[PDB]
């Protein structure tokens, strides 16, 4: 059936140690994603499993074997732009990483 209750019938794959403050690709009971994990001040009630954000995006989770809340934030991204004075004048450039 799936996606109806918290997962209870898993495969035989083993676990891995938890890391913080690093853009990593995680796997929480089949929940796949990428981001950084930091400590959070959200006071989850004892019955909820994870938080949720708009556009169906997971915002916070609690982990198995530890019952500790972990935040999720995507690692940095942005555009790039090149300052130039023209090939007729010079061949030097400057680079700008936006935001």
């Amino acid at each position: 059936e799936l996606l109806h209750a918290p997962a209870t019938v898993c495969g035989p794959k083993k676990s891995t140690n938890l890391v913080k403050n690093k853009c990593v690709n995680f796997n929480f009971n089949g929940l796949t994603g990428t981001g950084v994990l930091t400590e959070s001040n959200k006071k989850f009630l004892p019955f909820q499993q994870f938080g949720r954000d708009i556009a169906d995006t997971t915002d916070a989770v609690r982990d198995p074997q530890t019952l500790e809340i972990l935040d999720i934030t995507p690692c940095s991204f942005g555009g790039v732009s090149v300052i130039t004075p023209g090939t007729n004048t010079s061949n030097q450039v400057a680079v700008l990483y936006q935001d």
Partner: protein
């Protein structure tokens, strides 16, 4: 068989997902606002089940019985809270013509069992419950709060937290209450659930504080279609 207004009671956490400082609109089986709930008094008749039930009371109550045919011919659910250990079974129990407790006697002839579950129960206060059988699951919600009146229900707001979800998948169409009989009367209310739509209000902690019924009156329909708890001057198409 007296009638009493339900006011603004019977709101439960619908999805078990954390949220904060946001309004969410969901569709489920909710007890309509300002409804009429049958007030009983002493006697133990049998009542239908329909699509759910809302149960409230003001330690005389000693569990409930859910089933469809009884008389050990079809499965029947069992819930009882004795000796600080609630035990749930789905065995084939033959029921007396007038079941009362007062060891146990109602739940004799336990046989052809299929399910079993035991947990620790928890304790001028009202006890509210919502029983619902959907997609093969038996869901229960409850909350205990202090009260200061016996004539009718409080007019405040209060949300019910999920308690148990059992994978039974048994058809239920009738139920009755069970109270210990020894030889003070007890009063309880019964409501019914309907497929209505609600708009929920969340707090910083994630606790539901307000809710509006979208089919109560034109003002609430306007609030629901505007997704706000306040509306300005003008004319709006709903």
């Amino acid at each position: 068989p007296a009638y009493t207004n339900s006011f603004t009671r019977g709101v439960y956490y619908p999805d078990k997902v954390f949220r904060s400082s946001v309004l969410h609109s969901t569709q489920d089986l909710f007890l309509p606002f300002f409804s009429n709930v049958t007030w009983f008094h002493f006697d133990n008749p049998v009542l239908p089940f329909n699509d759910g039930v809302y149960f409230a009371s003001t330690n005389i109550i000693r569990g409930w019985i859910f089933g469809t045919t009884l008389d050990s011919k079809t499965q029947s659910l069992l819930i009882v809270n004795n000796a600080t250990n609630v035990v749930i079974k789905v065995c084939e129990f033959q029921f007396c013509n007038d079941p009362f407790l007062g060891e146990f006697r109602v739940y004799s002839s336990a046989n052809n069992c299929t399910f079993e579950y035991v947990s620790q129960p928890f304790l001028k206060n009202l006890r509210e419950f919502v029983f619902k059988n959907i997609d093969g699951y038996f869901k229960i919600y409850s909350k205990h709060t202090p009260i200061n009146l016996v004539r009718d229900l409080p007019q405040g707001f209060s949300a019910l937290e999920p308690l148990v979800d059992l994978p039974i998948g048994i058809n239920i169409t009738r139920f009755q209450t069970l109270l210990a009989l020894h030889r003070g009367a007890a009063a309880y209310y019964v409501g019914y659930l309907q497929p209505r739509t609600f708009l929920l209000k969340y707090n910083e902690n994630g606790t539901i504080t307000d809710a509006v019924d979208c089919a109560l009156d034109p003002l609430s329909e306007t609030k629901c279609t505007l997704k706000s708890f306040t509306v300005e001057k003008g004319i709006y198409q709903t």
